[PDB]
Each structure stands twice: as structure tokens, then as C-alpha cells.
Design a binder for this molecule. Structure first.
Ligand SMILES: [Mg+2]
Ligand SMILES: [Mg+2]
Ligand SMILES: [Mg+2]
Length: 87
RNA sequence: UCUACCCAUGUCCAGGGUGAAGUUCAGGUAACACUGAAUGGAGGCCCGAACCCACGCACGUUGAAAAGUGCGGGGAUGAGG
């Protein structure tokens, strides 16, 4: 467990001090879980059930990224640079 | 001392072509795949002298020669000479 990743990408674009539901925070946590799960699948190549989990996370993260991009174009660009995404 | 195979140690193979893997960059996707370009220089790879071979024909047949010559021919970085 890491609230580290919360308090980092809360404060970058914080609505509240104890913001949790910011797209920033969500996308960041998704990015952390995605990347963790990828390295599981490097080892456990034929864990297909878990891999469907990955594809759902990826789809959530994409949809939240498309949401920012349409909402706040600058705020989107700051998030993808810090996480190191492309889209 | 010919020749067959082997062992040790040397050496030879003008030139030209083709463009494997890999790599890089770009694209590419959540990751990979995958795509393009450049690079790269593989091969009992290609064309072709030396060299090695001996497919066809002619000639020769008391020969220039007890196996050759002429004109073409095959291999030519290899299980090579
Ligand atoms: Mg050859
Ligand atoms: Mg040749
Ligand atoms: Mg000849």
C-alpha cells in the first residue's frame, strides 16, 4: 500500500487537500497497478484471467485520460509527462 | 616419391554482385507484436580469371602425348585447392 502516490498527484492538481477522486490520482494509481501487473505477466505469461484485469485497468485509464484531454488540455499534458505516458 | 584416406604444419583463391540475422531511428501499441527506413555483411549464395576439375565435339590413334591438344564446359570461401 502507498498513499505516497496519492499525496504526490493530489497536490499537483488538488481540488481538496484530502482529494482522492481527482483524475490525476486515479490515473496515477491505475498506472501503478498496470505497471505492477505487467511485471507479474512477464513471469506468469499464461495467467490469462489476471491479464483480462489488466485490459480493464488500461481501458479505465484511457477513458480518464480522454476525459482530462477534453476537459483541461494543459492539466492533461502535465499528468502524462510526470507519469511518462504517450497516448 | 603414383594413388586412397588420415595426422602435423604452411600457403593460395583477380575482380564484381546479392543483401540473412542483428542494430539504430521513426511509426506503433497499456506492454509486446508488427511496420518502414537506414545500417549491417550472412552464405557448402550468385557471375567470373588464377587454380582445381574433366561434360560435349573434333582431332590424334606406328601420337607432339602408353590418356593429350583445340574449341566450348563445371567448381571457383569451401564437404575448397
Ligand atoms: Mg558458391
Ligand atoms: Mg563461377
Ligand atoms: Mg578447357
Amino acid at each position: 500500500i502507498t498513499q505516497e502516490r496519492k499525496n504526490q498527484l493530489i497536490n499537483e492538481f488538488k481540488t481538496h487537500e484530502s482529494d482522492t477522486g481527482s483524475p490525476e490520482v486515479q490515473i496515477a494509481i491505475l498506472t501503478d497497478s498496470i505497471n505492477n501487473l505487467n511485471e507479474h505477466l512477464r513471469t506468469h505469461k499464461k495467467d490469462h484471467h489476471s491479464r483480462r484485469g489488466l485490459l480493464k485497468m488500461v481501458g479505465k485509464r484511457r477513458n480518464l485520460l480522454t476525459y482530462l484531454r477534453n476537459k483541461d488540455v494543459t492539466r492533461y499534458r502535465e499528468l502524462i509527462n510526470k507519469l511518462g505516458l504517450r497516448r
